[PDB]
Curated annotation (Swiss-Prot), chain A:
Pfam families: Ribosomal_L3. GO terms for molecular function: RNA binding; structural constituent of ribosome. Constitutively monomethylated at His-244 by METTL18. Methylation at His-244 regulates translation elongation by slowing ribosome traversal on tyrosine codons: slower elongation provides enough time for proper folding of synthesized proteins and prevents cellular aggregation of tyrosine-rich proteins. It is not required for incorporation of RPL3 into ribosomes. The lineage of its organism: Eukaryota, Metazoa, Chordata, Craniata, Vertebrata. The modification N6-acetyllysine is found at residues 135, 285, 293, 365, 372. Residues 17-30 have a biased composition (Basic residues). This is Large ribosomal subunit protein uL3. The modification Phosphoserine is found at residues 12, 303.
Curated annotation (Swiss-Prot), chain B:
One of its GO terms (biological process) is cytoplasmic translation. Component of the large ribosomal subunit. Its main location: cytoplasm. Keywords: Acetylation, Cytoplasm, Phosphoprotein, Ribonucleoprotein, Ribosomal protein. The gene is RPL31. Component of the large ribosomal subunit. The ribosome is a large ribonucleoprotein complex responsible for the synthesis of proteins in the cell. It comes from the Eukaryota. SMART domains: Ribosomal_L31e. GO terms for molecular function: structural constituent of ribosome. This is Large ribosomal subunit protein eL31. CDD domains: Ribosomal_L31e. The lineage of its organism: Eukaryota, Metazoa, Chordata, Craniata, Vertebrata. The modification N6-succinyllysine is found at residues 38, 53, 58.
Curated annotation (Swiss-Prot), chain C:
It comes from Oryctolagus cuniculus. GO terms for molecular function: RNA binding; structural constituent of ribosome. Belongs to the eukaryotic ribosomal protein eL19 family. Component of the large ribosomal subunit. This is Large ribosomal subunit protein eL19. The gene is RPL19. It comes from the Eukaryota. GO terms for biological process: translation. It is found in: Cytoplasm. One of its GO terms (cellular component) is cytosolic large ribosomal subunit. Component of the large ribosomal subunit. The ribosome is a large ribonucleoprotein complex responsible for the synthesis of proteins in the cell. Keywords: Citrullination, Cytoplasm, Isopeptide bond, Phosphoprotein, Ribonucleoprotein, Ribosomal protein, Ubl conjugation.
Length: 394, 107, 60
RNA sequence: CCUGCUUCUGGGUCGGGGUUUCGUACGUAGCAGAGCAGGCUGCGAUCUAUUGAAAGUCAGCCCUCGACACAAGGGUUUGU
RNA sequence: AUGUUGGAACAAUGUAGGUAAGGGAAGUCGGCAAGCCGGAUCCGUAACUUCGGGAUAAGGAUUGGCUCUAAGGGCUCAGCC
RNA sequence: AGGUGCAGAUCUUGGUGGUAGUAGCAAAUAUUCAAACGAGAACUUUGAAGGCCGAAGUGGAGAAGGGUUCCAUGUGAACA
């Protein structure tokens, strides 16, 4: 017979293969398309999740109940050290799809990027790119490099760039940088190729790629949760207490003449560690890293127009399970996919952003830098000192 | 050189965080044998009975968080075995663990 | 060695259970060849096997 | 699956601060203490000061480069 | 010496225990299960009745520690136990 | 001349497979260190520590029933 009372199915089938991700770094499945009118620019960046905190800002949306009112928003902290460009790649375009044409690397590659080409750095002799770097000090080598560059002028349609993150500036335990192809969108192929040739072995800060109050896309891997049942993974109804063979299950799975159990039925398996792509994330603030001028360093990353306090975004005792943020960072509205120390892919939007929400500028009023290692109640260390006063240990 | 005796303090609390009540003390002796093979890498580890009394002094559930250990490597005597060196582990009663480094004591 | 016979014999002579019976762990070879209550009594005088004191149940 | 395993540098252990949880430790002194028994002394729950004190604090928190050893390793395969 | 073995892990489903913000049976054939009350002292206790009961009906208050006071006894009026 | 020919009868007897080195060795809080012995020690013996039975016991003796299971020595062929 038919089902007595209709109800929508549990779980979307668009994220059906709930397996462990074959990759750990987020992958850009579709880069933004390019038009020759725009200048050359980067379209993707790679960051690392630090933590989350509050924010205070003024809302300037017309016609609302919350217009000209102070709100709080959950914001993510993604520490984003600048990249080092180590190579470029060209793509000829085929009737069978998109095919890579030629990959050209730098003359000398930093050892942070050399970590990626080895499964075991301790036992290896670090012999990668040793004969490839001999091509840059012979006259036949330079003519071959220019012939390879001239070949990409003619045949390549899409040009990406190979850039890697900088583990030396991050407080993470690992030292192995993550390589990433970033599509360069801009003018014609020729000036696109010349711009990436100049940018070789150069620092690429975040401000070149992204800006404030801009829709971006976050790509990353879900927090791992291991093997889980249908009640946790698929959020099915719990069976009553009187069930004999258990109650955290799926009661009726399939019909009889459907002699095979279907692919659309909720079954137990791996939950979490799934590759995801979240869109329409708002950048409230692109921060600045620690920098030293006139002897002392500058750390007023949490300073706003009204706070004017020299505190940083690092809370009291630092970020929980991450470390301290010393490099420049981006502040994204709402929670993002992935756990602490998770590599995160930042990407420009694939859609034309013309809305009241996506074009609203943000003016920060107060950034909460209280301790997240419990119920914190102090913004800065010296504010607590002025309240607590002297202690026994003084 | 090879006969080296030195003081050590072990944070038992951080090596027991997670196990059940009926195995806290039986586990607690394991990271003392495991600790002894780390600095002086001798598989033959003998722990003194007074150390076993100190760990079991609060029963099987409550274990002292910090404990002071004289961890000494000595020559293996007759009934010859491939481990030509062994490590003797001795309990050291110390009232407080504030400002205790690893003291390299002498003979 | 193996000393369940001596502990059983030391239980009967001293008129108490084997809980309170203490054998010397260093003179094990001397205790092991007793095999009789007469030589068990000699080990009592020699101090090798000693009755353990009664556990306190203080009324204070 | 994701990391590290000597550029006198790396991590590990301990320790020190930061953060945080609970709530003011033992001992001492008090003419504070319902009072009680022989110039004061003995008992007295509790209170006060030492005392936001004492205790815990990554095992999956944060900075040390304070002290200590350890670290150029062991074994098995892979050819156009 | 832990009931005819151990060690390492702490995934789902289990079996046995618990805790849950707001609602309080809307769940279910059905308050199934779970949960509330609970000892003692002082008040108070209905309809009905075969006057024996109902009845610990129902419904209220108190409970710790310390320091004192009073009362309840034997041996020759006071002393001593 | 016959007790003369099997593929079956949920046939009889006997032997061997897949399952499968799988289900399982999860009712009653708990074991740890050192020494002895031994070729071999998580399980044997001794000492110490931490626990349980908590006198309606996991204690000390009986009746029925069992019948050498009681004691000493030795063994680790078969069982535990």
């Amino acid at each position: 017979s038919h089902r007595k009372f209709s109800a929508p199915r549990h779980g979307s089938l668009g994220f059906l293969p709930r397996k462990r991700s074959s990759r750990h770094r987020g992958k850009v499945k579709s880069f933004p398309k390019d038009d020759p009118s725009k200048p050359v620019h980067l379209t993707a960046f790679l960051g690392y999740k630090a933590g989350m905190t509050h924010i205070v800002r003024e809302v300037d949306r017309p016609g609302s109940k919350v217009n000209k009112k102070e709100v709080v928003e959950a914001v993510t902290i993604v520490e984003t050290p600048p990249m080092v460009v180590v190579g470029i790649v060209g793509y000829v375009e085929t009737p069978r799809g998109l095919r890579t044409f030629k990959t050209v690397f730098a003359e000398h590659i930093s050892d942070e990027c050399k970590r990626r080409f080895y499964k075991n750095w301790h036992k290896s002799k670090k012999k990668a790119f040793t004969k490839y770097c001999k091509k840059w000090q012979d006259d036949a080598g330079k003519r071959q490099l220019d012939k390879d560059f001239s070949s990409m002028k003619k045949y390549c349609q899409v040009i990406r760039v190979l850039a890697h993150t900088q583990m030396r500036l991050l407080p993470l335990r690992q030292k192995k940088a993550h390589l990433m192809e970033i599509q360069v969108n801009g003018g014609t192929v020729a000036e696109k190729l010349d711009w990436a040739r100049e940018r070789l072995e150069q620092q690429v800060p975040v401000s070149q790629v992204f800006g404030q109050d801009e829709m971006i896309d976050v790509i990353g891997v879900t927090k791992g949760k291991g093997y889980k049942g249908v009640t946790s993974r698929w959020h099915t109804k719990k069976l009553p207490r009187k069930t004999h063979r258990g109650l955290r299950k799926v009661a009726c799975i399939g019909a009889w003449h459907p002699a095979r159990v279907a692919f659309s039925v909720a079954r137990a398996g791996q939950k979490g560690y799934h590759h995801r792509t979240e869109i329409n994330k708002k950048i409230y603030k692109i921060g600045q890293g620690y920098l030293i001028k006139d002897g002392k360093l500058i750390k007023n990353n949490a300073s706003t127009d009204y706070d004017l306090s020299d505190k940083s975004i690092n809370p009291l005792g630092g970020f929980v399970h991450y470390g301290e943020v010393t490099n420049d960072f981006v502040m994204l509205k709402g929670c993002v996919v992935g756990t602490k120390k998770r590599v995160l892919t930042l990407r420009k939007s694939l859609l034309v952003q013309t809305k009241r929400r996506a074009l609203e500028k943000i003016d920060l009023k107060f950034i909460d830098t209280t301790s997240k290692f419990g119920h914190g109640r102090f913004q800065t260390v010296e504010e607590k000192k002025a309240f607590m006063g002297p202690l026994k240990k003084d | 050189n090879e006969v080296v005796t030195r003081e050590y303090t072990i944070n038992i609390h951080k090596r027991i965080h997670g196990v059940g009540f009926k195995k806290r003390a039986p586990r607690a002796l394991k990271e003392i044998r495991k600790f002894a093979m780390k600095e002086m890498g001798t598989p033959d580890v003998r722990i003194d009975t007074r150390l076993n009394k100190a760990v079991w002094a609060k029963g099987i559930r409550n274990v002292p968080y910090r404990i002071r250990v004289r961890l000494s490597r000595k020559r293996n005597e007759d009934e010859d075995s491939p481990n030509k060196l062994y490590t003797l582990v001795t309990y050291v009663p110390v009232t407080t663990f504030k400002n205790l480094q690893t003291v390299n004591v002498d003979e | 060695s193996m000393l369940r016979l001596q502990k059983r014999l030391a239980s009967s002579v001293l008129r108490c259970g084997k809980k309170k019976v203490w054998l010397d762990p260093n003179e094990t070879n001397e205790i092991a060849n007793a095999n009789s209550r007469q030589q068990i009594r000699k080990l009592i005088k020699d101090g090798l096997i000693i009755r353990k004191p009664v556990t306190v149940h203080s009324r204070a």
